[PDB]
Amino acid sequence: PVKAKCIATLAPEPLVEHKHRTLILHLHPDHPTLLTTRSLGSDANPTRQWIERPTTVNFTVTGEGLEYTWGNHPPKRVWAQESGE
């Protein structure tokens, strides 16, 4: 057994949607995709869920940031400061 880099997986890109300190994400994979995040406060408040059924989800993003992992697609990151004026 060797450390080959398999030609490997990739899940379709997400639909990013803005709200006030909140990411609505209409999402639509090919296969069951383990999504997960890390609210970068010292309060981690992570989430995990395999997604195979297309699902609009939500994420209470904080002031300092959140990150977002659409499958083995690379991890995203997001500034959600205010939007409530």
Binding site: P1, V16, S42, A44, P46, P75, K76, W79, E82
Partner: protein, 400 residues
């Protein structure tokens, strides 16, 4: 002029402080902590992996017993058995019918995947954090050097000597006990070398890959082969490395706090944005410009024109520059309210040049130090609309 500065630990954004040396012209900083890779002190305690019941081929004495001995193989399970009639290619071959004896033996051994696909425990201490700090300094305009955090280490790469930390935010996102797998790192209370219950994680526990000795609590129990046929019932828990790959927990690069990323590399935890770092630099005095050569800018005026109450450098402000000479003029807001994109502004003889910035208070009353000339750029700002992209440049939220 050894410019001490408390400094927030946050990776992807410069920290353009200002050198207020009494006597010569000030110089801006641009300190971008491009990385916060950690590399705690650790110890390889034991690799684990899934077993392989690589059965040695059983003995079959045809008429009478064959006592087994406890060979020193890891988890060397061996049990004599009688009452067989072993069908092997010619029907049976041993002519007795109860004195037909069969001695099954099986030991546990590292898989071939153990070398390569293997979890890996650690006792993790704190160690010492690092960074490839870029400073596009002053007029030097470049140094991208790897540094430390311990508050007496310089790194004379470029021309400047810089001392960092120790940081106050000692949260090692790694726990004391950690399991590691390929790239997914698990802050797991692995039981220990030498103990792991069969089926549970660490049923196989080898110190390293080379280590011929190990601990194999697999509950390997041989049973007698059936109805006078040659084979080896090995009844065994599939590994706690088999599970731990599909009934596991989530990775620390997906559950950590305070903003870290991970690698199976020196076991760093990159970019952990938390707390502050007391950083202090000894600039090369040659890089300074004497005060009598930069234009004096006073008798000026500053005002916002479209302040954006935001993260991206949306805040702007014209400045009625009132110079004496003409040239460059480093700029900074000593108040942390306003973070400015421009370190330096060019000046003709008393012109005007807008800069960009970002704030967090509706009424930004921040001083602006245009190369030894302070000014309040008071005003009012507007909220944006479009907030779903990576991390800010503002990082200055307070009471507003």
């Amino acid at each position: 002029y050894e410019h001490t500065a408390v400094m927030p630990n946050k990776v992807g954004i410069p920290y353009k402080a200002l050198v207020e040396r009494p006597g010569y012209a000030p110089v801006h900083l641009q300190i971008q902590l491009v990385n916060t890779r950690i590399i705690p002190s650790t110890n390889l305690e034991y690799i684990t992996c899934k077993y392989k019941t690589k059965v040695p081929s059983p003995v079959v004495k045809c008429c009478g017993a064959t006592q087994c001995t406890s060979k020193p193989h890891p988890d060397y399970q061996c049990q004599v058995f009688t009452g067989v009639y072993p069908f092997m290619w010619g029907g049976a071959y041993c002519f007795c019918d109860t004195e037909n004896t069969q001695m099954s033996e099986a030991y546990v051994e590292r898989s071939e995947e153990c070398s390569i696909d293997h979890a890996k425990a650690y006792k993790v201490h704190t160690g010492t954090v690092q960074a490839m700090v870029n400073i596009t300094y002053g007029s030097v305009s470049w140094r991208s050097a790897d540094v430390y955090v311990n508050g007496e280490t310089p790194a004379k790469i470029g021309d400047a000597k810089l001392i960092i930390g120790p940081l106050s935010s000692a949260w090692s996102p790694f726990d004391n006990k950690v399991v590691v797998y390929g790239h997914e790192v698990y802050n797991y209370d692995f039981p220990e070398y030498g103990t792991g219950k069969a089926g549970s994680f660490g049923d196989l526990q080898s110190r390293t890959s080379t280590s011929n000795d190990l601990y194999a609590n697999t509950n390997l129990k041989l049973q007698r082969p059936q109805a006078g046929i040659v084979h080896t019932p090995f009844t065994q828990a599939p590994s706690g490395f088999e599970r731990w790959k599909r009934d596991k927990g989530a990775p620390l690069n997906d559950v950590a706090p305070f903003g870290c990323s991970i690698a199976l590399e020196p076991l760093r935890a990159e970019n952990c944005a938390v707390g502050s770092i007391p950083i202090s630099i000894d600039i090369p005095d040659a890089a300074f410009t004497r005060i009598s050569e930069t234009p004096t800018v006073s008798d000026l005026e500053c005002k916002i024109t479209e302040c954006t109450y935001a993260s991206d450098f949306g805040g702007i402000a014209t400045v009625a520059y009132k110079s004496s000479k003409a040239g460059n003029c480093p700029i900074h807001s000593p108040s942390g309210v306003a973070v400015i994109k421009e370190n330096d502004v060019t000046l003709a003889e008393s012109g005007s040049f807008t800069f960009h910035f970002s704030t967090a208070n509706i009424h930004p009353a921040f001083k602006l130090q245009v190369c030894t000339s302070a000014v309040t750029c008071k005003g009012d700002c507007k909220p944006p609309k479009d907030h779903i992209v990576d991390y800010p440049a503002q990082h200055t939220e307070s009471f507003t």
